[PDB]
Amino acid sequence: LPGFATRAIHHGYDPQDHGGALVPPVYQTATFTFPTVEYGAACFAGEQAGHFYSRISNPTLNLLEARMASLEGGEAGLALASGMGAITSTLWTLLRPGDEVLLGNTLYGCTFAFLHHGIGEFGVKLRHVDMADLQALEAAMTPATRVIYFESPANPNMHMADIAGVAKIARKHGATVVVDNTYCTPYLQRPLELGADLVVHSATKYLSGHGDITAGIVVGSQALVDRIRLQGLKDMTGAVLSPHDAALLMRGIKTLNLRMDRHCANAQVLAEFLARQPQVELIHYPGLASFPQYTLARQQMSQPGGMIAFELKGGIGAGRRFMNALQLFSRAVSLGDAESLASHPASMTHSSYTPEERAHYGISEGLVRLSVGLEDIDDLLADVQQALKASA
Amino acid sequence: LPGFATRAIHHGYDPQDHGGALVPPVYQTATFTFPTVEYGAACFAGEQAGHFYSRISNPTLNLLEARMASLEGGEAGLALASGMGAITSTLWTLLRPGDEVLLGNTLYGCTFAFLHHGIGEFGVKLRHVDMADLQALEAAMTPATRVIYFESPANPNMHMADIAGVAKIARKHGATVVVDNTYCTPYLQRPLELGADLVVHSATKYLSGHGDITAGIVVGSQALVDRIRLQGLKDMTGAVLSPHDAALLMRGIKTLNLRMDRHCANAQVLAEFLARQPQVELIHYPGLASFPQYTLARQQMSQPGGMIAFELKGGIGAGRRFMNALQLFSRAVSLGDAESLASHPASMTHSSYTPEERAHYGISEGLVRLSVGLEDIDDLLADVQQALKASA
Amino acid sequence: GSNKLPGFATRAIHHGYDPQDHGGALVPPVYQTATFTFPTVEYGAACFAGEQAGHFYSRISNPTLNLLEARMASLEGGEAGLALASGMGAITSTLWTLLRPGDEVLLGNTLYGCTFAFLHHGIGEFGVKLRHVDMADLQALEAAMTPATRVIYFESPANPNMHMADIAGVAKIARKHGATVVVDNTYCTPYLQRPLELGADLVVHSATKYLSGHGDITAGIVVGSQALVDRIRLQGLKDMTGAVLSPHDAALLMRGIKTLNLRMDRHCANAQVLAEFLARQPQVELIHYPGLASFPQYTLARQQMSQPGGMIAFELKGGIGAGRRFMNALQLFSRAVSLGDAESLASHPASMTHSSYTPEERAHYGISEGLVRLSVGLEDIDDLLADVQQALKASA
């Protein structure tokens, strides 16, 4: 079996089948023609390998999908217009009124909003459980429980889930487990190999790597993904990925291993620096010995990742002064870009939450999230250093 | 007010704001940075006009949106990853369990599937009505009727609705009218100017014109479009349009008037041709005097369009052989490309309907649809001619 | 029957592409790839010496670029095409392969600025002889032919005063003496004029202009005989310019070519109405538009061009001074160089697109001060009229 970097570059593509083209040609076309109507009928009915319409399927998208499937150790992949496209397309097809879904305690803002203000308002029961607490999860299960959805690590406080433990329990009850693997990527964590049924990504982040596209990926079993393609995507979201964006995403994935290594190495130095600093109160970085879930993080993630969260003594006031003083880090939402980014999740990425919902689900007061980029660490260090002095 | 063609080329853009660039630069970027976190907080709150993240809003997409709104004569526009993206984003935000939607008698297949197998399985009630029979629409109205959704002309049989008449009834009872204006474009028909509240397009078709992107547009009031953006798109579908694809859509839109004029003139000649041929049983073209709703067509559409539907005397067998015989026309779904396209739902997309629902909602088995392209009319006639001999 | 040539519009959309040979894709997939690989070493042996019809490197050849080329060839009525990174890429790649020190090139009296500079300050400084000739004067062209004359090169209509040449007459002289005729057909496109059908050996285009139609790419095309285009490909482009067209840009060019006939019809109808409006105006000294009977070469235009085009050149009374106040007052027209965009443009050649000329060279080669060039776009004609009208009022 070829290695991870080899498959990220080559999997599912032989140049000899596309006139020798080293880079696959981009199928920037909306529709496909048939040699006969009989051939066409067969494509819609499902009984033929082939194409008809890019919302359903497209060869550039198919390559991305097969390749992502290989990196995650899944059977099938699906490409969508956004991470939210992936999550909604997935959850819209698996759930109906009277089904319940068990969620991780903390979710990405628009995931939270979709669950509570979106699909939750169409008769689907929601309940939040700590997915590190196995006995609390077992107690939460009902016969209505159809899906278990969570992020690990969780946006934006780094809370881990026991994916093996959760999936053991889900097998007993006949529940489908969906893991948002955006933060880690398949290079660092493969929830399907820990017993998850489906993984979703915002391919907008690390998988793209360069901040120039919005995209989503689902990977899992052939049977789940075929349902998500033919119902969620085709009929319920229409979250179709541009073939052009899919080729940039494939371009990004070719350096995923190298990029993640550098995100991790830079993030480690910055986190360790931030530990030894008088202005810092807490730190959530999985690679610090201090990290409360350090043991669980190491059983699931091969490296501690590119994201750091921390609080300052000074609270919300020092937050503003720190961020506004950054000269190399940029003040923005998003993560997993070559550029280093800094954000305040309560006013920005999780601004769908009210002040009570902020506090209820572990989203703090003076919390600053860093997405550590690929710049020279000395420059990043100097910038964080001078920004701490400015926050007094 | 500048002419349609002037606005399709210029509206919403001054080169002087973008370094003199004649063509707007493409904002192929996922995220946008802030100069301060208080500037950032103001953007998320709506208190500051600015950009943060492309799934919510992006300047290339905003120009497309503003231009399309001008062309439809409406206040605001939203760009999405597909026509289905437009439709689902729209209806998910407008409807909740116990709401009722009145539907045109015949709908595009994936719209039909979305309604009956998607949103209608989450507790939204559906009723189909003949939108040309105004008495029957009035009689079907209930206090739970929140949305009237239809296409005019409706695919594949070209059935029309009196938009102003429907809008009147909707105004009386207090319902929102949503019209799928894909077939006509704002160039031939403007449902907002006849009392409709929202219009949706598969911009994949005539607005693009060249078959190389998938895309959707919603136009209506600022109030409604803001809700569809911040709820339907942001949280419930994630059907984000690529900035690259939006730029190509704008490019297509600049020749919209010219292309539609040629589409219509070609289709008229072809329709008049087909009506005189011995193999043709029935033909539906708005520009033929024999069209059932000819008066309504001339009232509502400034030209009869590029789409033809006809039936061959010899049933499904003849349709198949007609389709297989075409050399210049391609056998494909989709419509409104430069390339002429034929589809015979009976031996293709019967169209995710049942045989009973096909026959009940008006989709015959001898029926072929033509999207008449921009080729030389003599070449198109000669291809059709020989395919009719072959049909026997 | 089936030996009928398909119509221009049909060929502009379809020629050289069958969806069946690319998994049914209706639009051809874009080969955004630098290099191509070989199944065996021996298959790759035959691609650097042509036994096998196959690909190796995009600077020489690429399937997206080849489709563009075969299609432009069909539209121009030539055997072969070559796509390049710009108009200047097409011209320089062509002239660098055809000329060597000691050869003479006879040139039209007026040339696009960068072409002029290329000839006088570029290739003219490497031992190539230049002489200008009025190509509308067939007796003078005959008199200028010498045994060293290798290439006759001109634009028709010329940029920017729209001087014309009799292409068929120039070619007949060239047949007798043994010279290669190269016509720059940027202004007309193959929709309005086809110099290869009138006897020319090569045509070149700034596809940046009407062929693209939307101002978003820079590109060139050369069309001619297989032997001359192969020479240009393997010498001019490969070794002497490296003016390689991006497959992305070639795709966008093909996209624009699909509406070339419709866009040109509207450009020509808009410009005709605008020219007739401008002829009837107090402030205009002279108006040059091929569709007005007052055009100095009216009958030659009617003879060679099927429609009069989208370019207008005129002078105001008030001279250069009045020119600035008119152009300054425009609000729908844009002040900019280039042409053949959906957007209507207005410019001043002597300070802009013919800056490569000195004051001496502008007056000698037919470029006035006070000349206002208009590229008439695809906007609603009433809007363009209203804008030019109000700008005339402000130029008094």
Add this chain to the structure above:
Amino acid sequence: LPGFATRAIHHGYDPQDHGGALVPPVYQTATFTFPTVEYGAACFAGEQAGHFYSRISNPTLNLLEARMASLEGGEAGLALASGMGAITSTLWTLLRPGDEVLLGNTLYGCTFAFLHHGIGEFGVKLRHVDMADLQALEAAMTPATRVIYFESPANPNMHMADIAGVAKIARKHGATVVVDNTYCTPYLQRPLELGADLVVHSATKYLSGHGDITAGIVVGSQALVDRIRLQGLKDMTGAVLSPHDAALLMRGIKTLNLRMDRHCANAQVLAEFLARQPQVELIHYPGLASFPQYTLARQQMSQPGGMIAFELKGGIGAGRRFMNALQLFSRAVSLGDAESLASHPASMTHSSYTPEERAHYGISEGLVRLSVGLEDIDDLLADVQQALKASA
């Protein structure tokens, strides 16, 4: 002075100057408008710092140019359609008939062809000289010598020049030293800091990194680059780089450091392996202690590069057998891609030639050259291994 990786991501771009866009917007526009014709006339004369036409200058190309200038430690950059674009625009600008150009002993095929069959047939004199041998180079200088042009490393294979020594000699005669730095990239070697006047690149190779664009770069002093822009590019080649491709090139450059590190580490492993094999007569790789110019290589290059050339004992026949048995390496010319590439010039690029022609050019019958990609080294080793066994 920020680090290399930081500058490769950030240099010359502030998001705040473009509505916050994290990634720079792509100026896919041929022309630029003016607010007045006064402003317009000034741009052409050089008195006003604006934009007018993308063949001369474009904001997206300018950013690429400033960034490459920074990485090479030069005053100014120029982006062109290809590496040959950059070479030809440079040489057409600096040379006239009767000038002499002093050349490295071996050159890239198309460079050689340009010199001998292009500009050389316009009265420019050519002389080849060993650029490591300072006394022969000094001896070869004439008053006609205006340019000294070479690659380092070159490709007969990997022969190096003493760039600081060449520059010392050129300064005594006013001559301009142009170095093709394609193989190293600015990350490994910066010829301008060792005294060269101009560097050219085929950015098609490592700078892009992904095999998807053709592009060239020139970096040097403002006055030379200005003339190459306004004469070579503008008038003599028209080798204009698409802004789309320039954007992809910039995207590629953000991982340059990480890719070059991995190219080099894979190459070092394969070189060590190949040097010990019985099938291998001879090997050229700068990282091997046996490399003839090891000391000179280490003075100029921070790492030994991703290219290896070696000679098999079985001659042309074993060369072919090796190539044909490769499963993971592709048979292709070009280099610097994520995909590993092999060429055997004796049976590919120079097969039309005689066994005597190849000999005097420095091309052994069994000479194979490898562009070592970014795949996992164990897979590359397995592929090279079995191919060596098949070459017997």
